[PDB]
Amino acid sequence: DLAKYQKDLADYPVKLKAYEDEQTSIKAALAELEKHKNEDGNLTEPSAQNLVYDLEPNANLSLTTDGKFLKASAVDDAFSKSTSKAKYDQKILQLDDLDITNLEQSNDVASSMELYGNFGDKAGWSTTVSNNSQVKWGSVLLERGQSATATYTNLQNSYCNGKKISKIVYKYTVDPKSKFQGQKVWLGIFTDPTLGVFASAYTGQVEKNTSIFIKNEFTFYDEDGKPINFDNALLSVASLNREHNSIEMAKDYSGKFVKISGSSIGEKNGMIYATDTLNFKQGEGGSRWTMYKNSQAGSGWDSSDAPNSWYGAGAIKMSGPNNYVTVGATSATNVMPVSDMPVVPGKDNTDGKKPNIWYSLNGKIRAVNVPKVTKEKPTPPVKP
Amino acid sequence: ADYEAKLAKYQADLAKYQKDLADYPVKLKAYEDEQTSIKAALAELEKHKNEDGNLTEPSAQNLVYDLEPNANLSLTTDGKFLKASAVDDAFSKSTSKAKYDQKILQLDDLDITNLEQSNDVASSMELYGNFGDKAGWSTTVSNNSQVKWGSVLLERGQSATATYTNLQNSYCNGKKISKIVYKYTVDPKSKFQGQKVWLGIFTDPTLGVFASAYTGQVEKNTSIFIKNEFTFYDEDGKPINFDNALLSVASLNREHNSIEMAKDYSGKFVKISGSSIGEKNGMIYATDTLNFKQGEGGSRWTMYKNSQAGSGWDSSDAPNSWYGAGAIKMSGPNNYVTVGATSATNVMPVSDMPVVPGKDNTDGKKPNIWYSLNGKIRAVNVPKVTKEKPTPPVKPTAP
Amino acid sequence: RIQADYEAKLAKYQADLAKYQKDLADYPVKLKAYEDEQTSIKAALAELEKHKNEDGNLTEPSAQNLVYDLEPNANLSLTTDGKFLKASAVDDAFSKSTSKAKYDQKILQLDDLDITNLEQSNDVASSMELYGNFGDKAGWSTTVSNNSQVKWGSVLLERGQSATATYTNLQNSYCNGKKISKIVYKYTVDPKSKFQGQKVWLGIFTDPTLGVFASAYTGQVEKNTSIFIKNEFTFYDEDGKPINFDNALLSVASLNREHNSIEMAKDYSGKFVKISGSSIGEKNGMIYATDTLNFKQGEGGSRWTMYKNSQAGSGWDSSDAPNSWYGAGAIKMSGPNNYVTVGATSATNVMPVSDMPVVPGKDNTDGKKPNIWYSLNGKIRAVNVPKVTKEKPTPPVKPTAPTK
Amino acid sequence: YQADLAKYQKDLADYPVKLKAYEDEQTSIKAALAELEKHKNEDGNLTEPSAQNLVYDLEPNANLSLTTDGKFLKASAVDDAFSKSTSKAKYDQKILQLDDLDITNLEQSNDVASSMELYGNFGDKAGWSTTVSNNSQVKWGSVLLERGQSATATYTNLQNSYCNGKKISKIVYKYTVDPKSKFQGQKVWLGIFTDPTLGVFASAYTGQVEKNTSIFIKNEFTFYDEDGKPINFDNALLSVASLNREHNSIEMAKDYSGKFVKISGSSIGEKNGMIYATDTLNFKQGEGGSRWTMYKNSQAGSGWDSSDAPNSWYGAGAIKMSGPNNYVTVGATSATNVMPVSDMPVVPGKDNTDGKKPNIWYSLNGKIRAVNVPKVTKEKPTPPVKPT
């Protein structure tokens, strides 16, 4: 420990300078950002990000549930049938077309979590959540009020105020107030916690006045297994899609909404969503940009890497060790009267939708050049 | 301690980089869409290239240079600057007096004899025109619209160099033109009887120049030629390399006794179908017909407005102004052309000339000319290149 | 001092007049040299059109306007958000564990280096230090260039950490006929790398055309492993202005595929350029040996052996081999900022075992070392590719005489 | 007195401007010569840096008056000669090809005029071309001379020309046929251009080439100021340009007042008191050591032999002259007259003893073909003298 003390003593001046230099850099960054806070893609209230939590592709997932684990063979069989079959036959896993009716048989139930995705015997397949990149998920079948608790470990890239995040515990609960017509919800929980979850009650037909909402309760843990007390951490809520008949939203959250200037996403009645315009197709219902890639400038905003992904994103500023938010998709008719809605020629706002959603909660704030806090102030070493 | 100063500079450059980065996809799409539009326009024009008013070889115009009323003129000379008071005095006397007394500045009637006195010389350029106490006067350049010019008195081989700045509307290959430097030289081969030339150089460079050796009487076997040498500059002060820019040479008047022409030019003559203007022996002019009066010497149309259809072709605005125009396709940063007016007898024998009964082709003419060199191509439906291909921005490096 | 400054501007103007007259006199020769090269290139490409489906030829004939293959005297400056490694620490690591056997034989075997011995606090340098077969190791060989002298700067990086190399003292390299004076190249450890450890050693060669050695190897092979390095680069002219690539050909050579291991390029700016007959193709946005191995003649469909032996065409994997195109492709790139990720991955990460070539006696699931040597340069491995060495000259502009 | 007071007041007002103009030009010239010293052994530079105080480049509007002890030729006779024999094919294409004019058709008694008459591409031949002008207008007076006979040209109506800032108002030039000329015929046609800077076309050509031939014209000239006083040259630079050397033919200057001034890299040098292409031909790139082709083609630097070509110095030199009365003999001679065939450049397929036409176009003017030679255009003004 004398040898370790001598090592920490030798390293201390370098660590202290690294901390002071980053603090100087952050203060300069925030001073410049104050001048651009009402320009497109900038936080309206400049802030650093002390939650460095962007990607964990090599994470390990352990899952408990009071619903049913689904066999990988059952998930495969369901993808191969009904509404997702056409894409499956083209080596594409189309999660938003999966008809969950083929996951509801007694023989589909596993005794423990099993992984599925475009790896192993499906290495080289594509998915709708990844393109070509590898994604893996564990699957559960839940009723209203049932949950799965995910424990993520083998984290490699993530820090909170310069403290390594070693474990994340996240409980996903089906909100009983969800309006989906079916009996069950499939949760596909990605092994990379930054990719979040695919939640579906889809039975192969669209539903009017429908919704699916998942409550999220999470605690982050340090290398000693102690909960990390967030201190104005920025939680990114990206990809909040609004079509003429469908709204994705966050609600019932433990913190304060943070606006990105120029974003479609705002806060109204304690809900975070595209409050005033659609965000699906440029020139439809007030949308500035098309969510999918086409010939139009700024098209394809709805991607992890798109420079204008902020168009469909906001953030929530959170403190404390235990945080929560409910995320889901709902028919527009559940949120507001038809008289209050954008009218798109040829599109009926009362059209049914699929009761499914892909969402994620992570530190990847979609505002431009938000400065990261990566260095903690070092503590003087104590001689034994 | 100045790590803070370099961080502030870097953060400002990062914000500028982020702006250019955000704008790049919009600029790229705008460029690609215009390129698609131009290629479609040129495909259609191929079908009409031998119809009146069309370029015989379809071309876009990448020189957008037709209106600079707010340009600033700075002038140097190895001749003499003329006092605005001297130019006013000259307009008020002799052959231009009758028009002056009617509140008209008639540049082609100005007798330059009254600009040749020692006390007419200014130490620097002075502006004159229909502005200030002559606001609401007319001139022969732009009717009622305001025009201003700086004046010099030059001998053969003497020059004035005009620097035009405060340009607002002009682009070359989608690059903004910030400065034009243009040298005007009196060609010593000019045959005018006098020793002196007045140049009136308009503050709007697109209006060009009025050049005169006129001393109140017409001259046989006369000419006045001005050499023009020009370089266009971008916002960084770098010369702009023309790339098949179309330089418009309009208003090349041919009367029974007089030919206006361009010669000694960089680049290649571009024919407008149906135009009186062609190229012969390295000269651009009305090669086969006059263009003054309908039915006289093969002219289709009357150059001045009257009761006849198509009359008044010789105006910036006339739909058939192409009748007296051509163009020169030019490349490179340094271009040149000589423009002037010459007695017909200097160009060809009387035996070769159009016959207008009752008009004498040997009649003397005034040794003066109004000409301009600009991007205002007089051919119809010529598509403009307004967008340059954008370059992705390069990210600055954190100190 | 009116007169005194008029005299200073006159001296400057008279000097520029002399220079203008020189550039004016030289312009016709430069223009003819450019036109003659353009004529030669167009004739060369017309002939190449007849051979585009023959071994070693580009399938889409192209000239190479990126002349970038020879920079042994380049100077390297390095920044990092990881750790610089002491030359003494790199030497100590080579002397221990899996590279010791070769070290004791005066060979620096980069692909045997156990990076465990670079991970100690006392291994960290405050600035870049060079190591290699020079100075007291002038007589030594390395796996990069045999007996020829090679030098590298070393960093220790975690996932997402980077080193930025600035290469200067460039002598032989041109882009579109413009001399390249500086290259700025950022190397980032891709967090999607699947190696078991936390750390990567980058050995960045002083000659930028030699590229980088990247290793997460800790002395044991790894199943389902990978190491990927993101490469972001801008080239600069003599005035320090970025050079806009214009369909430059970036060579990606030595993309080795063994029964259990695939080297590949992915996440690239630009478009893949196929060499006819090459093992290298494009699938799912990745450039690699898509359909055969390329290690040993007759193993998993390989035409040729990558190392020299008794077999005809053996030793394809060398800078100089006439059939080095067998393991190469290219990327056609434009603009001032270009990028590509290069790395090595277990075959099981790319495709199911059922889709893989079968080599009797070899297990395709065998672990591999998470390390790679790669380079990105203009040394296109296709045959008879004509070079663009002349830029179109611009006529000089005459300076203006100053006044008083 | 009278209104000399008004003129004195004018000169008084102008004097500070003229003095500043002089001082500023002198500063500019000194700076130019300092820079030229650094480049004097580079292509196109005078080997001894010098300013040019003879500004004498073009006089297109000059008036010509001519005396002769030979014969004036009718313009109608010159026209008839161009329309016949070796120049007819070009004449019928509206081209006056001076070097193809067969002077045999100028030798008839009825061809003689009582005074000088002008001919050229003007009047009824406006828009014709000539070999001395291309399309530009040129006019000449014509005489028919024997050996030792002369014509004296007086040029007035000069518009552009100065000597040390003093306007040149008159030039008097005597052209004499050198009796040592070796041409086979009896007569020489001189076409004397109205623009004195264009010089003369001298021809003894009778429609066939001649071996061991020559034609030389002696030139004696005085320049005059506005008061009709001779101008004393002070190291004026006389340009001798377009000294063509083909495999069988040498154009040269000799018997000159003043000193030869070399242009670095020029084919033109001085040997045995003669100025010519001493060591190489200058006709075609790669023939007999020529660096460049005299006519325009695909080769860089081709077309050197033009008034405006940037490398026209390749066929030029200069003569530095002083005093009011200067002279030089210019002409064309068979190569065999200058040196033994064993000393000549060898051009495969070309015979160096081939006959040539005994004709030449030459000019003597101030248009020095070296680069960046600064001009003296301003004289130091004299304070005006107040009358009575």
Closest Cβ–Cβ partner in B76, B241, B333 for C403: B76
Size of interface B-C (CB pairs under 8 A): 27
Q: How far is CA B296 from the centre of its chain?
A: 28
For residues A330 and A336, what is the distance between their CA atoms, to the nearest angstrom? 11
Q: Do B8 and A41 touch (CB under 8 A)?
A: no
The answer to whether the CB of A376 falls within 8 A of the CB of A18 is no
For residues C187 and C203, what is the distance between their CA atoms, to the nearest angstrom? 11
Q: Greatest CA span in chain A, whole angstroms? A: 77
Q: How was this structure determined?
A: X-ray
A308 annotated ligand binder:
no
Dihedrals phi, psi of B371, to nearest 5 degrees: -140, 160
Residue with tokens 């999918």: A292
**Residue C237 to residues B399, C174, C179, C370, Cα–Cα distance (Å):** 22, 9, 6, 36
| Chain B residues touching residue D126 (CB < 8 angstroms) | 345-349
For residues A134 and A115, what is the distance between their CA atoms, to the nearest angstrom? 12
Domain spans of chain A, in order of start: 51-362
Residue D265 half-sphere exposure, CB side, CA atoms within 13 Å?
A: 17
> Where on the phi/psi map is residue B378: left (φ > 0), alpha (ψ -120 to 50), or beta?
alpha
D270 annotated ligand binder:
no
CA dihedral (D375, D377, D379, D381) positive or negative: negative
Pairing of strands D326-334, C261-266: unpaired
Helical axes C2-48 vs D4-36, angle rounded to 10°: 50
- Give residue ranges of B with CB < 8 Å to any D CB: 118, 155-157, 188-189, 191, 195, 281-283, 345-349, 351-352
Residue B28's closest chain A neighbor by CA?
Answer: A297
**Residue B105 to residues B87, B207, D25, Cα–Cα distance (Å):** 11, 16, 38
Q: How far does C10 lie from chain D, in Å, by closest CA?
A: 6
Q: Do B25 and A369 touch (CB under 8 A)?
A: no
- Rg for chain B (alpha carbons), in Å? 24
Under 8 Å CB-to-CB from C56, ≥6 apart: which residues?
C275, C276, C277, C322, C323, C325, C381, C382, C383
B touches which chains (3+ CB pairs under 8 A)?
A: A, C, D
Query: What CATH superfamily is the domain B63-371?
Result: Major cell-surface adhesin PAc (2.60.530.10)
For residues A375 and A50, what is the distance between their CA atoms, to the nearest angstrom? 9
The answer to whether the CB of D73 falls within 8 A of the CB of D143 is yes
Residue D195's closest chain B neighbor by CA?
Answer: B189
For residues A373 and C76, what is the distance between their CA atoms, to the nearest angstrom? 30
**CATH number of this structure's domain C66-377:** 2.60.530.10
**DSSP three-state, residue B374:** strand
Closest Cβ–Cβ partner in B161, B334, B394 for C337: B394
∠ at Cα A329 (A326, A333), nearest 5°? 120
Residue B242's closest chain C neighbor by CA?
Answer: C394
Q: How far does C63 lie from chain D, in Å, by closest CA?
A: 25
Q: How far does C121 lie from chain A, in Å, by closest CA?
A: 7
The answer to whether the CB of A315 falls within 8 A of the CB of A235 is yes
Instruction: Give buried/exposed letters for D251-265 (b at 16+ CB in 10 A, else e).
Output: bbbbebbbebbbbbb
Q: Do C395 and B76 touch (CB under 8 A)?
A: no
For residues B10 and A24, what is the distance between their CA atoms, to the nearest angstrom? 13
Residue D11's closest chain B neighbor by CA?
Answer: B118
Residue with tokens 């008719």: A333
The answer to whether the CB of D22 falls within 8 A of the CB of D378 is yes
Q: Do C351 and A156 touch (CB under 8 A)?
A: no
Q: Do B118 and D14 touch (CB under 8 A)?
A: yes
Q: How far does B268 lie from chain D, in Å, by closest CA?
A: 18
Gap positions in chain C, given as the residue before each gap (C–N > 2.5 A)?
Answer: none
How many other CB atoms are there within 10 angstroms of residue B343's CB atom? 23
Under 8 Å CB-to-CB from B158, ≥6 apart: which residues?
B77, B78, B79, B185, B186
**Cα–Cα nearest to B283, from B300, B311, B256, B259:** B259
Residue C310: Cβ-neighbour burial (10 angstroms; 0-12, 13-18, 19+): exposed
**What are the residue ranges of helices labelled H in C78-232?**
87-94, 100-103
State both tokens at A146.
């049932």
Q: If you write DSSP's letter for every residue of B82-104 in order, what string do you get?
A: E-HHHHHHHHTSGGGHHHHTTTE
Touch between chain D and chain A: 3 or more Cβ pairs under 8 Å = no
Position B280, amino acid: K
Closest Cβ–Cβ partner in D31, D38, D42 for C10: D31
Closest Cβ–Cβ partner in B181, B239, B391 for C244: B391
For residues A171 and A169, what is the distance between their CA atoms, to the nearest angstrom? 7
**What are the residue ranges of helices labelled H in B213-333?**
none
Closest Cβ–Cβ partner in A10, A121, A157 for C121: A10
Residue with tokens 């290699």: C132
Q: Hey, which residues does B172 pair with through a beta bridge?
A: B63, B175
**Cα–Cα nearest to C267, from C219, C228, C324:** C228
Closest Cβ–Cβ partner in C10, C14, C29 for D300: C29
Closest Cβ–Cβ partner in C335, C397, C400 for B333: C397
∠ at Cα D128 (D122, D130), nearest 5°? 95
For residues C187 and D279, what is the distance between their CA atoms, to the nearest angstrom? 63
∠ at Cα A265 (A260, A266), nearest 5°? 85
For residues C27 and C393, what is the distance between their CA atoms, to the nearest angstrom? 7
**Residue C395 to residues B35, B174, B256, C27, C218, Cα–Cα distance (Å):** 28, 21, 42, 7, 60
Q: Hey, which residues does C329 pair with through a beta bridge?
A: C252
Range list of β-strands (E), D89-206: 95-96, 112-113, 118-120, 129-130, 139-145, 150-156, 162-163, 166-167, 170-177, 188-193, 200-203
The answer to whether the CB of C69 falls within 8 A of the CB of C180 is no
Instruction: Give buried/exposed letters for C366-376 (b at 16+ CB in 10 A, else e).
Output: ebbbbbbbbbb
For domain D54-365, the question of CATH label 1.10.287.70 is answered with: no
Q: How far is CA D68 from the centre of its chain?
A: 20
B59 annotated ligand binder:
no
**Cα–Cα nearest to A216, from A64, A356, A362, A323:** A323
State both tokens at C285.
């946005």
The answer to whether the CB of A121 falls within 8 A of the CB of A169 is no
Q: How far does B176 lie from chain A, in Å, by closest CA?
A: 24
Residue with tokens 């009649």: B363
**CATH number of this structure's domain A51-362:** 2.60.530.10
| Chain A residues touching residue C192 (CB < 8 angstroms) | 55, 57, 133
Residue A272 half-sphere exposure, CB side, CA atoms within 13 Å?
A: 28
| Chain A residues touching residue B395 (CB < 8 angstroms) | none
What is the rounded end-to-end Cα distance, in angstroms, of chain D? Answer: 6
Sheet with A314-320, edge to edge strand ranges: A230-237, A314-320, A256-258
Q: Do A298 and B25 touch (CB under 8 A)?
A: yes
The answer to whether the CB of B297 falls within 8 A of the CB of B255 is no
For residues B382 and B272, what is the distance between their CA atoms, to the nearest angstrom? 11
Touch between chain C and chain A: 3 or more Cβ pairs under 8 Å = yes
| Chain B residues touching residue A374 (CB < 8 angstroms) | none
Q: Greatest CA span in chain C, whole angstroms? A: 91
3-state SS string for chain A: CHHHHHHHHHHHHHHHHHHHHHHHHHHHHHHHHHHHCCCCCCECCCCCECEECCCCCCCEEEEEECCEEECHHHHHHHHCCHHHHHHHCCCEECHHHCCHHHHCCHHHEECCCCEEECCHHHCCCEECCCECCCCEEEEEEECCCCEEEEEEECCCCCEECCEECCEEEEEEEECCCCCCCCCCEEEEEECCHHHCEEEECCCCCCECCCEEEEEEEEEEECCCCCECCEEEEEEEECCCCEECCEEEEEECCCCEEECECCCCEEEECCEEEECCCCCCCCCCCCCCCCCCCCCCCCCCCCCCCCCCHHHHCEEEEEEECCEEEEEEEEEHHHCCCHHHCCCCCCCCCCCCECCEEEECCECCCCCCCCCECCCCCCCCCCCC
Q: Do A28 and B4 touch (CB under 8 A)?
A: yes
